[PDB]
């Protein structure tokens, strides 16, 4: 009972720290996008508006790294509680230490204050004529900043209701269910499969369009792939795999985003089609109503189909008795067609009855078993 | 019993006439391909080799049309036998007459002997410069000759064993089955679904590549899409829907074949994927063997996984009693990892046992019902 | 009983008003297409033939807006009957008012009479050279007129038989079914799924091709994408995700229609494939006939396969007794091959019987349960 209070207190601290790590993680990304766009036209990389904006990214990274370190200090303490340890060194495995260093390395890649440049040589597309520019080093550190979006998944997991609720933990323990990050992903794909795929597709659209534009702007003198709508059109027909080819990136950074989008859009479109084809299917209760109304329609159609069979048969007999060769033959053709039409509706009614008796098979078995009791 | 002899006699005549209509129907197509490929090269359209090779197409069309007329006269006679009619005029509906004339129109389109030419003005691709050429009139009459392949479907149906066998007709009558060309298509897609899709894809490859080459050769001077291997490369990348765009046809005839191949290849590749995915699935008898061997492996894994749990548990105790702080700490990390490893294999074994019960559910129900008997 | 007469009366008026709003909604679209195509070459935008055709669209929009207003007043009266309210203000919510204004705004966008122009500056594709033209303002108002096609969904729903029939309303009430526009969509995709996707695809082909041509005609001095057969080719290679890239639109309007065709064509082709794959599958009554005939065929194959096993076994013995080394060796390779062929047919017969017993499992359960009764 003593460990139950500690476990709840430590979980609340971990959830609170994850919320602040996302606030500072997303703040640095936002300031990076603002600084990247403004440093092109508004001012230059040697201005005081760039030293004062890259010190906001740098300061936010320092606080973000502190929140990552403190978050893992709470995870170590929670380990020492669940596993009944007294020394934190028992938790320091080679896999935990690797992931601690991986998160720190990912969250420490940001534009360092100062004007640094490197010579970027790329061969243009189609013409394949060499082009050289003195691109800044703050472009190869701004793109990796998008890797901080992994904190979104941690926030979603920690804020999940069934992750900490005692009602769900007790029920999950009975079925031996592990409430890891895969379970939250699978439950999201069953509750709102279309909203998850639509949000992911739009988020990937804007992020990939900006990444291509931010990389292509150095080797683009005709505002072709360095335009936001020229990169939001370039990365729209790669997601759909149309691939017109009128616009392709000139660099290996825009070619690694087109390649990534082609992979993501190859599967997202197929998953979206599966979701759409699953929402256009009648439920088990709406299929019983549809079959009930079709049965009434087919019974009425068989009444009018058999009526025409006798109506044309007697019209044939009436004209035959009157000795009218052409009229008798004209109505004998109609009798044959009426019989064929009556056979067609009788067969489609038989098919419906078979379908009806195939979905009420296991349910009918329950009724027989109840009687035997 | 009298009509049984006449029905079998008329069915043999229909089968015999369908075979000869396919012999002459394909003969006209083959001679058309020979004459089309040679008129561009060896001789011209005003030679005596073109008057003698287009009279073979014309002569085979006369015989082919004669066999189509006689074949439908046998279907009229078979109608009067089944329906018990005495006048063939009762068999002449507006749908049968239209289909009789549709087949005759389709089978009468052949290159007429003689040298008739028309002006073909087309707009080239990627430049849209007009190109006027004096094309022969036998290019707009050779492409429709490929519509004679509908006789292949008729021959397959009339030669099918279950279409006429008295054992299959009697069984089909019990289940109210209709043995038409659609039933033959469905049975082929279940017996050999890959052979049907592989022969169709290969046959469409050669036919469409030749059609693109034949049409897109009056407006081609660089030997690009007027080459058979250039047309066979344009068509394949449309079937796979890659669409490089390096070569696109200059004519409306080559553009309507790439569109036709694109539609067919959109569905053929999807159907092929389903076939290759239904053959990689273990059958119900191979899943029981695989599950049986997995259960044996998991039981052996649990014996060695729990053995390591106790081995490290005692190794922790041995060093703790010897007062070795670092050694005991290392053997407590290994004990915790051994416990987690034991849990993982125990959970994956429980999942397999649940999967075994899910498949063996109804068969277990049958045994209980037998006991109640 | 009193409200039944008023609810049926108000439904008939709503159905009648929905038909007339489609008559005037589609008439304005048709006259828009006529005037757009004729004001290009036949006359100019400052003619008396354009002030008299754009006043037909304006006159039809006034009547259409009146029918929309009256239709929504009939919906208010129907709501006051169903919910039992007496004051129309109880029906005016923030969601109903928003959709009333949305339909008015959508249906009020039409080419206003007059000659107003705006400067359209685009950039040609494959060279991105500027191109500035003075375009009429009636091109940015003609395209939104296609949003009146939402009235087709309203007409389809109100004209649905089960939407008002008392037999379907009572049966649906038992299963707690909601007869809305989504239910009609789902029943359409089960009754005729290949007639809904084919009509939608063809209608989208004509509409999108005209929209592309209309926009891609102020910035087309080569008649490349401004041609109707050159716009249909573009839309078709985007629907099938081929993307040759020989023609791409020069404007954002054409690039938006081509992006909408790519999204629709990604899912429409996948949905069509699933339809053609569920129609090429043997039904539950045709599988039993196919399995019955396969069982007879496999039994006959086993008789002839075992006959070859013994025939070669004795032929081996006859030559061995005759002291013929080469003959006996040849008849032993044939015997081993005959045994393998006998095993192959015996195994595939066992597989078929496994499939036959798998489908007839639950039906056999019903027979046992009936016997226990």
């Amino acid at each position: 009972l003593g460990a139950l209070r500690r476990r709840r207190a430590l979980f609340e601290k971990r959830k609170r720290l994850s919320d602040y790590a996302l606030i500072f993680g997303m703040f640095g990304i936002v300031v990076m996008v603002i600084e990247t766009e403004l440093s092109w036209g508004a001012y230059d990389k040697a201005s005081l508006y760039s030293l004062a904006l890259k010190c906001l990214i740098s300061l936010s990274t320092i606080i973000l790294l502190g929140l990552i370190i403190v978050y893992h200090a709470r995870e170590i303490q929670l380990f020492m509680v669940d596993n009944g340890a007294d020394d934190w060194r028992i938790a320091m495995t080679y896999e935990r230490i690797f992931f601690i260093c991986l998160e720190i390395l990912v969250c420490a890649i940001h534009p360092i204050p100062g004007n640094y440049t490197f010579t970027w040589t790329a061969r243009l597309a189609f013409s394949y004529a060499p082009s050289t520019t003195t691109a800044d080093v703050d472009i190869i550190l701004s793109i990796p900043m998008f890797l901080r979006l992994y904190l979104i998944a941690r926030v979603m997991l920690l804020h999940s209701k069934l992750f900490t609720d005692a009602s769900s933990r007790s029920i999950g323990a009975l079925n031996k269910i592990n409430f890891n990050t895969r379970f939250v992903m699978k439950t999201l794909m069953t509750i709102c499969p279309g909203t998850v795929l639509l949000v992911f597709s739009i988020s990937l659209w804007i992020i990939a369009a900006w990444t291509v534009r931010a990389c292509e702007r150095y080797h683009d003198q005709q505002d072709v792939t360095s335009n936001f709508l020229g990169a939001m059109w370039l990365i729209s027909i790669t997601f759909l795999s149309i691939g017109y080819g009128d616009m392709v990136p000139n660099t290996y950074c825009g070619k690694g985003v087109c390649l990534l989008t082609g992979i993501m859009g190859a599967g997202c479109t197929a998953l979206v089609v599966a979701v759409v084809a699953r929402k256009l299917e009648l439920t088990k209760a709406e299929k019983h109503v549809h079959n009930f109304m079709m049965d009434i329609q087919y019974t009425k159609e068989m009444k009018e189909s058999a009526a025409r069979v006798l109506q044309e048969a007697w019209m044939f007999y009436k004209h035959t008795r009157r000795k009218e060769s052409h009229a008798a033959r004209r109505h004998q053709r109609k009798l044959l067609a009426a019989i064929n039409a009556f056979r067609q509706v009788r067969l489609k009614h038989r098919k419906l009855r078979e379908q009806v008796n195939s979905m009420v098979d296991i349910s009918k078995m329950h009724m027989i078993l109840y009687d035997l009791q | 019993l009298g009509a049984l002899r006449r029905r079998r006699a008329l069915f043999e005549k229909r089968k015999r006439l369908s075979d000869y209509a396919l012999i002459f129907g394909m003969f006209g197509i083959v001679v058309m391909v020979i004459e089309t490929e040679l008129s561009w090269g060896a001789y011209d359209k005003a030679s005596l080799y073109s008057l003698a090779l287009k009279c073979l197409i014309s002569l085979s069309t006369i015989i082919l049309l004669g066999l189509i007329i006689v074949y439908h006269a046998r279907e009229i006679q078979l109608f009067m036998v089944d329906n018990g009619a005495d006048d063939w005029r009762i068999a002449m509906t507006y749908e049968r007459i239209f289909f009789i004339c549709l087949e005759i129109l389709v089978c009468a389109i052949h290159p007429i002997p003689g040298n008739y030419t028309f002006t073909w003005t087309a707009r080239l691709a990627f430049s849209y410069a007009p190109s006027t050429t004096t094309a022969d009139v036998d290019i707009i009459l050779s492409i429709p000759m490929f519509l004679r392949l509908y006789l292949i479907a008729r021959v397959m149906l009339l030669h099918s064993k279950l279409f006429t066998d008295a054992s299959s007709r009697s069984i089909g009558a019990l289940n109210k089955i209709n043995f038409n060309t659609r039933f033959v298509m469905k049975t082929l897609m279940t017996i050999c679904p890959g052979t049907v899709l592989l022969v169709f894809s290969i046959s469409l490859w050669i036919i469409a590549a030749w059609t693109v080459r034949a049409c897109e050769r009056y407006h081609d001077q660089q030997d690009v899409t007027s080459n058979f291997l250039g047309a066979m490369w344009l068509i394949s990348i449309t079937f796979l829907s890659i669409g490089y765009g390096d070569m696109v046809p200059n004519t409306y005839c080559g553009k309507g074949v790439c569109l036709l191949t694109g539609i067919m290849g959109a569905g053929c590749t999807a159907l092929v994927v389903a076939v290759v995915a239904r053959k990689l699935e273990l059958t119900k008898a191979e899943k029981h063997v695989h599950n049986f061997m997995m259960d044996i492996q998991y039981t052996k894994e649990m014996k060695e996984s729990a053995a390591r749990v106790l081995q490290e548990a005692w190794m922790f105790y041995k060093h703790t009693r010897r007062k070795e702080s670092h050694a005991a700490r290392r053997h407590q990390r290994k004990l915790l990892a051994a416990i987690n490893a034991f849990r993982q294999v125990r959970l994956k074994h429980r999942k397999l046992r649940e999967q075994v019960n899910s498949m063996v559910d109804i068969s277990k129900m049958h045994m209980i019902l037998y006991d109640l008997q | 009983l009193g409200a039944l007469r008023r609810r049926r009366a108000l439904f008939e008026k709503r159905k009648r008003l929905s038909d007339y709003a489609l008559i005037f909604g589609m008439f304005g679209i048709v006259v828009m297409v006529i005037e757009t195509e004729l004001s290009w070459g036949a006359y100019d935008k400052a003619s008396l033939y354009s002030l008299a055709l754009k006043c037909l669209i304006s006159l039809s929009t006034i009547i259409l807006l009146g029918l929309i207003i009256v239709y929504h007043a009939r919906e208010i009266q129907l709501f006051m009957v169903d919910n039992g309210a007496d004051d129309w203000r109880i029906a005016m919510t923030y969601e109903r008012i928003f959709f009333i204004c949305l339909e008015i705004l959508v249906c009020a966008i039409h080419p206003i009479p007059g000659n107003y122009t705006f400067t359209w500056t685009a950039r040609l594709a494959f060279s991105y050279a500027p191109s500035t033209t003075t375009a009429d303002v009636d091109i940015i108002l003609s395209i939104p007129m296609f949003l009146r096609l939402y009235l087709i969904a309203r007409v389809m729903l109100l004209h649905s038989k089960l939407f008002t029939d008392a037999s379907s309303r009572s049966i649906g009430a038992l299963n707690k079914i909601n007869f809305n526009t989504r239910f009609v969509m789902k029943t359409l995709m089960t009754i005729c799924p290949g007639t809904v996707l084919l009509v939608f695809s063809i209608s989208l082909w004509i509409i999108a091709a005209w929209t592309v041509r209309a926009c891609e005609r102020y910035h087309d001095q080569q008649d490349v994408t401004s041609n109707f057969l050159g716009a249909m080719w573009l839309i078709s290679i985007t629907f099938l995700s081929i993307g040759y890239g020989d023609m791409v639109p020069n404007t954002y309007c054409g690039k938006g229609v081509c992006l909408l065709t790519g999204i629709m064509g990604a899912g429409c082709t996948a949905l069509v494939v699933a339809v053609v794959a569920r129609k090429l599958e043997l039904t539950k009554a045709e599988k039993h006939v196919h399995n019955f005939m396969m069982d007879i065929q496999y039994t006959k194959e086993m008789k002839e396969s075992a006959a070859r096993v013994l025939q070669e076994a004795w032929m081996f013995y006859k030559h061995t007794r005759r002291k013929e080394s080469h003959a006996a060796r040849r008849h032993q390779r044939k015997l081993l091959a005959a045994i393998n062929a006998f095993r192959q047919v015996r195994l595939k017969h066992r597989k078929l019987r496994e499939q036959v017993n798998s489908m007839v499992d639950i039906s056999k359960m019903h027979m046992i349960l009936y016997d226990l009764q």
Partner: peptide, 12 residues
């Protein structure tokens, strides 16, 4: 550019 393919690509 001899052909129109090279005219279109070198311009883009």
């Amino acid at each position: 550019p001899e052909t129109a393919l090279c005219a279109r690509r070198c311009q883009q």
